Protein backbone atom coordinates (compact mmCIF):
# COMPACT_ATOMS: atom_id res chain seq x y z
CA UNK A 1 0.00 0.00 0.00
CA UNK A 2 1.15 3.51 -0.88
CA UNK A 3 1.83 6.29 1.64
CA UNK A 4 -1.30 8.23 2.65
CA UNK A 5 -0.60 11.76 1.43
CA UNK A 6 -3.44 14.19 2.29
CA UNK A 7 -5.43 15.92 -0.48
CA UNK A 8 -4.88 19.63 -0.99
CA UNK A 9 -7.71 21.96 -1.91
CA UNK A 10 -6.06 24.62 -4.05
CA UNK A 11 -8.84 26.79 -5.46
CA UNK A 12 -12.35 28.00 -4.70
CA UNK A 13 -14.31 30.65 -6.54
CA UNK A 14 -18.09 31.14 -6.45
CA UNK A 15 -18.72 27.50 -5.67
CA UNK A 16 -16.17 26.03 -8.11
CA UNK A 17 -13.37 24.08 -6.44
CA UNK A 18 -10.13 22.43 -7.52
CA UNK A 19 -8.60 19.73 -5.40
CA UNK A 20 -5.30 17.85 -5.68
CA UNK A 21 -4.77 14.21 -4.71
CA UNK A 22 -1.30 12.65 -4.57
CA UNK A 23 -0.05 9.13 -4.97
CA UNK A 24 3.60 8.08 -4.63
CA UNK A 25 3.76 4.47 -5.81
CA UNK A 26 6.32 2.68 -3.63
CA UNK A 27 7.43 0.57 -6.62
CA UNK A 28 8.56 3.70 -8.46
CA UNK A 29 9.92 6.33 -6.07
CA UNK A 30 10.64 8.84 -8.88
CA UNK A 31 6.98 8.97 -9.87
CA UNK A 32 4.27 11.18 -8.44
CA UNK A 33 0.68 10.93 -9.62
CA UNK A 34 -1.44 14.01 -9.11
CA UNK A 35 -5.15 13.86 -9.83
CA UNK A 36 -6.89 17.19 -10.08
CA UNK A 37 -10.61 17.18 -9.33
CA UNK A 38 -12.87 20.11 -10.26
CA UNK A 39 -16.20 20.35 -8.46
CA UNK A 40 -19.07 22.82 -8.68
CA UNK A 41 -21.55 23.51 -5.90
CA UNK A 42 -22.89 26.72 -7.43
CA UNK A 43 -26.19 27.27 -9.20
CA UNK A 44 -24.53 27.54 -12.62
CA UNK A 45 -22.67 25.01 -14.79
CA UNK A 46 -18.96 25.23 -15.49
CA UNK A 47 -18.15 24.79 -19.18
CA UNK A 48 -15.07 24.74 -21.40
CA UNK A 49 -12.94 23.88 -18.38
CA UNK A 50 -9.24 23.55 -19.14
CA UNK A 51 -6.48 23.10 -16.60
CA UNK A 52 -2.94 23.79 -17.77
CA UNK A 53 0.04 23.03 -15.55
CA UNK A 54 3.74 23.84 -15.34
CA UNK A 55 6.58 22.47 -13.24
CA UNK A 56 10.26 23.46 -12.88
CA UNK A 57 12.50 22.13 -15.69
CA UNK A 58 14.25 19.99 -13.08
CA UNK A 59 11.14 17.78 -13.25
CA UNK A 60 9.14 16.14 -16.03
CA UNK A 61 5.38 16.54 -16.39
CA UNK A 62 2.91 14.50 -18.43
CA UNK A 63 -0.78 15.32 -18.75
CA UNK A 64 -3.50 12.81 -19.39
CA UNK A 65 -6.67 14.03 -21.10
CA UNK A 66 -9.31 15.22 -18.61
CA UNK A 67 -12.51 13.25 -17.99
CA UNK A 68 -14.45 16.12 -19.53
CA UNK A 69 -14.84 19.89 -19.87
CA UNK A 70 -18.13 20.47 -18.03
CA UNK A 71 -18.89 20.49 -14.32
CA UNK A 72 -22.68 20.56 -13.80
CA UNK A 73 -24.14 22.80 -11.10
CA UNK A 74 -25.18 21.67 -7.62
CA UNK A 75 -22.52 19.01 -7.14
CA UNK A 76 -22.61 17.55 -10.61
CA UNK A 77 -20.21 14.96 -12.01
CA UNK A 78 -16.69 16.25 -11.31
CA UNK A 79 -13.91 16.62 -13.84
CA UNK A 80 -10.81 14.60 -13.03
CA UNK A 81 -7.44 14.82 -14.79
CA UNK A 82 -4.22 12.93 -14.16
CA UNK A 83 -0.78 14.54 -14.01
CA UNK A 84 2.28 12.31 -14.07
CA UNK A 85 5.39 13.87 -12.58
CA UNK A 86 8.85 12.30 -12.75
CA UNK A 87 11.27 13.63 -10.15
CA UNK A 88 14.27 11.31 -9.74
CA UNK A 89 16.48 14.08 -8.38
CA UNK A 90 14.07 14.81 -5.52
CA UNK A 91 13.89 18.47 -6.51
CA UNK A 92 11.36 20.56 -4.57
CA UNK A 93 8.05 20.26 -6.39
CA UNK A 94 6.52 23.51 -7.56
CA UNK A 95 3.32 23.58 -9.53
CA UNK A 96 1.73 26.49 -11.38
CA UNK A 97 -1.80 26.11 -12.73
CA UNK A 98 -3.82 28.00 -15.31
CA UNK A 99 -7.56 27.44 -15.10
CA UNK A 100 -9.85 28.72 -17.80
CA UNK A 101 -13.59 28.13 -18.01
CA UNK A 102 -16.98 29.76 -18.41
CA UNK A 103 -19.31 30.18 -15.45
CA UNK A 104 -22.35 32.45 -15.04
CA UNK A 105 -21.65 33.71 -18.59
CA UNK A 106 -18.28 34.98 -17.39
CA UNK A 107 -14.94 33.99 -18.88
CA UNK A 108 -12.78 32.87 -15.99
CA UNK A 109 -8.99 32.96 -16.12
CA UNK A 110 -7.11 32.09 -12.96
CA UNK A 111 -3.39 31.48 -12.69
CA UNK A 112 -1.46 30.70 -9.54
CA UNK A 113 1.39 28.79 -8.03
CA UNK A 114 0.27 26.09 -5.63
CA UNK A 115 1.40 26.70 -2.06
CA UNK A 116 1.64 24.17 0.78
CA UNK A 117 2.50 21.20 -1.43
CA UNK A 118 3.18 18.35 1.00
CA UNK A 119 6.88 17.46 1.18
CA UNK A 120 5.84 13.80 0.81
CA UNK A 121 4.94 14.54 -2.80
CA UNK A 122 8.60 14.98 -3.77
CA UNK A 123 11.02 13.90 -1.03
Amino acid sequence: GSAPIPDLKVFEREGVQLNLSFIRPPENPALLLITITATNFSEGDVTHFICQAAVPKSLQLQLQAPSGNTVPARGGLPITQLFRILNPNKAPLRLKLRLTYDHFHQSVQEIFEVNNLPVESWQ
Partner: peptide, 6 residues
Protein backbone atom coordinates in the same frame (compact mmCIF):
# COMPACT_ATOMS: atom_id res chain seq x y z
CA UNK B 1 14.39 25.96 -13.25
CA UNK B 2 12.27 27.28 -16.16
CA UNK B 3 8.70 26.04 -16.77
CA UNK B 4 6.14 25.81 -19.60
CA UNK B 5 2.36 25.86 -20.22
CA UNK B 6 1.46 23.46 -23.03
Amino acid sequence: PDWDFN
